[model samples]
Target: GAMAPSYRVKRMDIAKNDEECVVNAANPRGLPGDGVCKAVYKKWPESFKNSATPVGTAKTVMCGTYPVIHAVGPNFSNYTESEGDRELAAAYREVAKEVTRLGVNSVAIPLLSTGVYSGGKDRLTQSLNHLFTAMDSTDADVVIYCRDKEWEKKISEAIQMRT
Candidate 1:
């Protein structure tokens, strides 16, 4: 039921999306503070570092052809599982709104709590549930960028189960 035409799961480079945007689990400050963000920092040094984007929500910044979407998804260090899940969904919903408005064809997204924050399997499942449930009929493609084979497998499984 959660399988909309816009959503997809795959293992690939987040920045490889030629069109649309890439969603990064970001800080409220808008700096590519850590994790895969280092790569983003390298790509768009000044802008990423100096940005003053919102936190606990989603925001977009155009970076050439492929824009960047920032989501302050969830922090295991601070919030409970339920709280984190809600935050993840909120961030994702905001991202979807921005994606539809931007009219980009696709977006690359990571498992919000599983990356630099290390939220583990339970967090991954909760994040996916919230994300898929929140997204509606946006025409833009949503790519779940996998950081590794394990991530790819989990994402694929989640997609399969939900669809």
Candidate 2:
């Protein structure tokens, strides 16, 4: 019998995860700002130098024991909701593409663009929706990291609706 794709939500730091690859919500310039990106930068600053990934695209860099996928999510402050959603989905899809290309068995990701980038609660739900859709094609196990309990609940509810 065929098995369903696996997705788990964990309340922890992505940097501490043991996944094969960790997807960071990155900027086009590839420089880490506040939020999770900053924490990631602290772990591997050299990997980010001269690495500029455009919005809706992603690039990978090997750091420590696992590779880091810098996925540039859209800045909602500069885009309409519809446009932002489109770009956000594309960004997540890019991560799936990278995971498949790398042939990695596991990957960890965060709620893209829902922080200092200005995406709202609706966007948070949309991020998971897009992630689920994009990751459906890949066999890699997925782990979503959320430090906030509320976000974890929201993600769980979203998964329930999708399943």
Candidate 3:
């Protein structure tokens, strides 16, 4: 049997996670503007390889004690709700694939596209759903790091509804 997947919603910093890998919500142009992206950049500057990754895709960069998977999610401000949902799901899907490919036992991820990308609360809920669904297919344990207590509550509720 495959390893049982475990999910947790914690109020913490993604860059500080001690998981085997960290999935960064990166921009397609590979720029670290603010929020989780900037936090990751601050810790692993060399991981930002300046490569223009496409939306719904991911690239891996070896940094610090673990690898960082730069998953480019859709900017909801620029996309319709449907488009945003599709791309966000794809990005998480790509992250799961990367984790499986790397044979990692665990991974930490932040809420993708919900930051300066303007995905907002609705997108936050959507992101959690998509992330949980995608990661369910992988054997790696998943830890979702939220920036605050409110987000942590919401994510915890979302996970409960799904399970």
TM-score (all chains, Cα) for each model: 0.82, 0.90, 0.91
Selected candidate, larger TM-score, 1 vs 2: 2
Clashing pairs in 3: none
lDDT of each: 0.68, 0.83, 0.83
Model 1 TM:
0.82
Query: How far is each candidate from the true structure, as Cα RMSD in Å?
Result: 3.3, 2.4, 1.9
Worst 10-residue lDDT window for candidate 2 reads 1-10
How many steric clashes does model 1 contain?
A: 0
Q: For candidate 2, give the lDDT.
A: 0.83
TM-score of 2: 0.90
Q: Which candidate comes out best when scored by TM-score?
A: 3
Show pairs that collide, candidate 2: none
Regions of model 3 farther than 4 Å from truth: 1-3, 119-121
Poorly placed runs, candidate 1 (over 4 Å): 1-6, 46-50, 119-122
